Amino acid sequence: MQVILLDKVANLGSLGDQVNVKAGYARNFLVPQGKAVPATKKNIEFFEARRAEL
RNA sequence: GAACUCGCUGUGAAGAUGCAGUGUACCCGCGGCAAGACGGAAAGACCCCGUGAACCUUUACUAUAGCUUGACACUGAACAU
């Protein structure tokens, strides 16, 4: 779903963009194995500050 | 059910110990034999009814467990023909 990436994962990733992917690829691979974070409307404002400040 | 509980012919819910006619018979036991009293025993089991019941059977009706087909969800990413 609306998950935001953090890693060099293959061609849907650009070090973090909101994509439209299925929920099966969301959980257990992106929801924690690393490499991403769920977007439960709290991380879309927290990691947005990580984009601007860094 | 009660009886002081005879046989005939005929009558009769159509096979009479009780009716009618008639015949016969002292009163009362006991030992016997089963002919009858449509004997006793079982609201006939056979048969037919009841818009009875019960099971069982099937290409009766309508359901359903299970089996089976497909879709969605659990369930993904890359691709290619």
Swiss-Prot record:
Domain of life: Bacteria
Function: One of the primary rRNA binding proteins, it binds very close to the 3' end of the 23S rRNA.
Family the UniProt entry places it in: Belongs to the bacterial ribosomal protein bL9 family.
Subunit: Part of the 50S ribosomal subunit. In stalled/collided disomes (pairs of ribosomes where the leading ribosome is stalled and a second ribosome has collided with it) bL9 in the collided ribosome contacts bS6 and uL2, while it contacts only helices of the 16S rRNA in the stalled ribosome; the inter-ribosome bridge thus formed is different from that formed between normally translating ribosomes.
Name assigned to this protein: Large ribosomal subunit protein bL9
Species annotation: Escherichia coli (strain K12)
Location of this fragment in the whole protein: 1 to 54 of 149
